[PDB]
Amino acid sequence: IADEPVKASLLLHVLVAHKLKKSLDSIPMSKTIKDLVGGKSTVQNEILGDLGKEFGTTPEKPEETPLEELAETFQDTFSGALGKQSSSLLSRLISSKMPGGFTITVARKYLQTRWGLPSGRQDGVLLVALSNEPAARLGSEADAKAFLDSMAQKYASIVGVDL
Amino acid sequence: MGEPIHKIATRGVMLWKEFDETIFNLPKNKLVPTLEAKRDYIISRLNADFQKPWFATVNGQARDLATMTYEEVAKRLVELMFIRSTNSWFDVTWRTFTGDFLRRVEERFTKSKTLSLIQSYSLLDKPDEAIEKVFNAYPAAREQFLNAQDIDHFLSMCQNPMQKPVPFVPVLDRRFEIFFKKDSLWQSEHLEAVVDQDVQRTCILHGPVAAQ
Amino acid sequence: GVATSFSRKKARTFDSSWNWAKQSLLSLYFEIIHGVLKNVDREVVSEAINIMNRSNDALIKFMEYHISNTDETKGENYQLVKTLGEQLIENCKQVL
Amino acid sequence: AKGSTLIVVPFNQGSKQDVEALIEFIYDTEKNGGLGWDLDAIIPFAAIPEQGIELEHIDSKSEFAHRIMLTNILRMMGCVKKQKSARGIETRPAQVI
Amino acid sequence: NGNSADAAYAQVEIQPRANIQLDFPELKPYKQVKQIAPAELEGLLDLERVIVVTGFAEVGPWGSARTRWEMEAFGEFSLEGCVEMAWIMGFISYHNGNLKGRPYTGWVDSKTKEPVDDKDVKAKYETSILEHSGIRLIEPELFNGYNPEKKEMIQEVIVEEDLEPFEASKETAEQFKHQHGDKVDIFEIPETGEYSVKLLKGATLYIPKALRFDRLVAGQIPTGWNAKTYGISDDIISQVDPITLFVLVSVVEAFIASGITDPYEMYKYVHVSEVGNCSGSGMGGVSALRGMFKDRFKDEPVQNDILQESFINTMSAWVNMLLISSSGPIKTPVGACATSVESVDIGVETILSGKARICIVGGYDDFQEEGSFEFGNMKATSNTLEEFEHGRTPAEMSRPATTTRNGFMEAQGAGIQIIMQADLALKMGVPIYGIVAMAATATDKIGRSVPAPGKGILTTAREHHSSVKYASPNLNMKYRKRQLVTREAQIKDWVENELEALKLEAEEIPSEDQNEFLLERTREIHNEAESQLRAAQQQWGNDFYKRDPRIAPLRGALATYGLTIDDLGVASFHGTSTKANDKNESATINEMMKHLGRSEGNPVIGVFQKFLTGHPKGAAGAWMMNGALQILNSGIIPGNRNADNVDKILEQFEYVLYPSKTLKTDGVRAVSITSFGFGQKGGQAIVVHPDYLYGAITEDRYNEYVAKVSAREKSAYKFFHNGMIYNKLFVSKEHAPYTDELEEDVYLDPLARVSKDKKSGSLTFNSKNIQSKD
């Protein structure tokens, strides 16, 4: 399958979703962060700090503009490199939720083998996995394999890839 | 269904026309907020001018179902659906409706399994003594507004299709057009069964040109 | 069938008759005031017996107070309780 | 009534060890963990119902019932005789109803 | 004769539907309530200094105050109680629509969605309801998988031989390197760019081990209880400590019991600065403390603001932020087991000091693993393994005043009461469940045992008896009324003399300014006449015994309403079911009664509610106060059904009776509520029957009140049933009653009041009603 670097749009959506502890679909792309976190002033500047040290440079007054053009303004400079937040969140996802012995290298290898996804798509499927964190502990290899399968399906359906 | 109809321009049809222009043309999303806003106007006009009055009205005061006692409700049913002149229920399905409501009252205010006081709805063919009998066995029902479940049950009985439509609007919601416009043709031929025997409430179909 | 059930630790002891006497009297006193027990009821004599069988100086003063502060003008049932009281206080004094 | 006490204990009259333990409990002193009583009466009305069991049906349940209603009533009495004798009690007999 | 001849014979059976009632206090005719109180009471009391319990609620092991009371007083559920329990526990849910083709309106099983008739609820769910309510084996699924039979710990081991290297990210490898120093080797992997971590010999690891803990039983809120069922949104549920949900439900349910469906209604009557929150906890959000002390240490994912959720003052903050939007006092006490009585003590004084006119008072505490374990280590709680050895079932492990009592049962929940000035309660037409006659706290003395119960609260019965030959004229209500009448004539003279002096001063002012001058000075003389009368009433009616050392605060509190020490019918005991507590509290109440000359043979009737609910700590007295008010307004005194055998030691306390069965009495006039916290927190409260208030007002004011209450009750029953069936009892305020521009204008005008907005239909502060002359 053709390589494709992760879109700032997907990364932004996954980071916001994960940070609010909400399903990747529940958050609509065309809404300001301020509307999503209306009350909590703490989670406001906490999401802004997370997007700061993810995408380096941030637009002036970013929290009262919808995620539509924020994705575009980041994408302009952003070059599909996971950065720090998403790398640390994926490490935590693997180490805190995997069978044991099944590391991120083995997950990526399993994606590359069975689904034939290169590093660009692997980053994307893993970000989708982060958005749907099993919030427990995958029991056996078979459970983790099935989980990665169901995540690869969702990723493919989001980006528009066939398997 | 949105078909044009020539009617005699009575107060009722004037009301109908007004609502067609101002309420029933509005899109489904803006219908309910407009009804809420205009509730007190809409209820006054129904009660003054139309052949289907606002049901929840006690001594001319515009209540709601939620703010009406079970006795107030039963007396309003007998006042709208039982003809004093002919000393009979206009429709037998209306008598059933009223009995169903009295049995619900006994169900809500009895402490243990008992016999209904209304054993056959034929007893309601003298409605005042039947009311007094039910609200003497259950005098708590004179003082308590309708349970939210009984409001829901009432509104459910008002949409029963194996029944002549109710001669009143019980609620302002998304189905206000159906409550207002359904079964509007019999009243002109049965003025005894209209609020004040007022023709000016009713819909009378008639050609503009044949009216010369 | 022959499984052992007995254990010393599971033995339950009842011996607080001094407390139950006052409860028994009070329950009677209110049952007569509420007209649950009438003057013809044999359970009024059974409860008398039970209160006499537990009589002491704490119970006698408990009865004296509750009976000598019953307002008989409040109803028939109050005159009935006050009459039966005064009798029961005499009985409980004789059987102390 | 005044000076009465009631002591409710769980007990299987079917069990020999329950019978020994119950009597040995009633007759132990308060320090050792018992009532430090000395029985004046024994009323052994423990029974289990046998209905429909004729001679050819006599089985486990009947043989058990017979241990509750005879054998272990002789063990209760025996135990009460052993305890009274042990404590040299010869003028306070326990009436068996 | 066919089947048509027997159809007219056949007759219809009416099955009952549950018609749940808010059990507002019954209001007698003025003629009957005038007889209970002395004739001198009318006009005597300053009703702005009389505190009343206007509304109450709880969340606890038996559901609500309604369901708890049925279980406490009657030992079994009614149709109403059973339906209410099934709704709370989530077994039934309302349905109004299409159900398998036919249109249905009623209860349906919440899993199958099959219709359920109210009559069938007891046959279908009562067994489940009883099995999963009250004091019962700890349910792990209610405490984040906590199982006292398998209690996780970690033991520090030293490595003896190197571990198989494991994969880790660069960051977490550096973190493993930073901690272990030279006892670990982290190497980058060139291929992929992550790191291998090898723990060497002498490295420190923590290996999980499971301890079997001996406290297996607790008073837990019924299984199924969900804040969503009352209408609390998922974004609140996620944010806050589970304790806060109990407080938020208790506070809306208390407001409903007060007939206040919209809290903003209060602001038609009082400024925003006059609604206080005086409620408190012993430990606050212990689930958040776990979060920040254990879950953070174990690198588990915890919300960043978990700190704020732990503070005891944060539950009252959420109540202000979501329901009340007041700017009134906020005084959060921390009294351990006496918290809820300290809360009433503070809230009474907050109102008597003029700072607030309404307080929310009460307490709340959670049950979690760490507190359960620590209570076991102090041997405060009953050891459940010993109770099984004694053949006790969980239901009969809390048994106060019993011979064999051996530690309290930990429970969880909240209890709230709304208190306010009688004057405002009558004016608003809210129900009145009881008068708070007295509320006090006491420490004990010099000692070295923080958990030791003491006798400091004995001081509420402190009286000089050196010279008691002649009864003081101060106790005689006629004398006090005669002195108030003398003073009322002198105030009348004083107002005549100020009004003539104002007329003399008006002539010097030019006629164009004379109107405004006379308005401004007449209002001031009105204010100062009100103030002087209220001070007379206060000095003769309410506070006749503050400067008297021959009148105990406890005696004076009852004498206010014409009652005597003999009229204190019921004493709700802390009664935890511990050796030291139950003797000490008996002994204390006994000394109070004996000192105040309580009649020989008139013991107070002990009520030990913790036999049913268990000891919820903070919330303990808030439950006892909710039961005291239910005792008063019913005359039913519940029995301690776990009082198998009253301790022989307690017999010496002749002024106390320990009943085992409910006594339906002909009226209770007053109830004492005693609590004894950890850290020498003794507390008492006296609640008087509400009918002793109405003796102090006139028939026209009484009849006005009775009409307002009747109306408010009807409105509240409508609110309650709607909210129940559509899961919207709780409705979070999105906006304050003022805008952010009006905020400072409303805060600085004491006579600003909310007005019905026509457009929205909601209660808002309009700009016209701020610094208005009207």
Curated annotation (Swiss-Prot), chain B:
Coiled-coil segments on the chain, per record: none
Organism superkingdom: Eukaryota
Purpose: Fatty acid synthetase catalyzes the formation of long-chain fatty acids from acetyl-CoA, malonyl-CoA and NADPH. The beta subunit contains domains for: [acyl-carrier-protein] acetyltransferase and malonyltransferase, S-acyl fatty acid synthase thioesterase, enoyl-[acyl-carrier-protein] reductase, and 3-hydroxypalmitoyl-[acyl-carrier-protein] dehydratase.
Quaternary data: [Alpha(6)beta(6)] hexamers of two multifunctional subunits (alpha and beta).
Note: Present with 91800 molecules/cell in log phase SD medium.
Stated family: Belongs to the fungal fatty acid synthetase subunit beta family.
Protein name: Fatty acid synthase subunit beta
Residues of the whole record sequence present: 850 to 1061 of 2051
Curated annotation (Swiss-Prot), chain E:
Enzyme active site: C337 (for beta-ketoacyl synthase activity), H574 (for beta-ketoacyl synthase activity), H615 (for beta-ketoacyl synthase activity)
Descriptive protein name: Fatty acid synthase subunit alpha
PTM sites of type Phosphoserine: S472
Record-stated family: Belongs to the thiolase-like superfamily. Fungal fatty acid synthetase subunit alpha family.
Domain of life according to the entry: Eukaryota
The encoding gene: FAS2
Organism: Saccharomyces cerevisiae (strain ATCC 204508 / S288c) (Baker's yeast)
Domain Ketosynthase family 3 (KS3): residue ranges: 155-689
Note: Present with 17000 molecules/cell in log phase SD medium.
Stated role: Fatty acid synthetase catalyzes the formation of long-chain fatty acids from acetyl-CoA, malonyl-CoA and NADPH. The alpha subunit contains domains for: acyl carrier protein, 3-oxoacyl-[acyl-carrier-protein] reductase, and 3-oxoacyl-[acyl-carrier-protein] synthase. This subunit coordinates the binding of the six beta subunits to the enzyme complex.
Subunit structure: [Alpha(6)beta(6)] hexamers of two multifunctional subunits (alpha and beta).
Post-translational modification: 4'-phosphopantetheine is transferred from CoA to a specific serine of the Acyl carrier domain by the C-terminal PPT domain. This modification is essential for activity because fatty acids are bound in thioester linkage to the sulfhydryl of the prosthetic group.
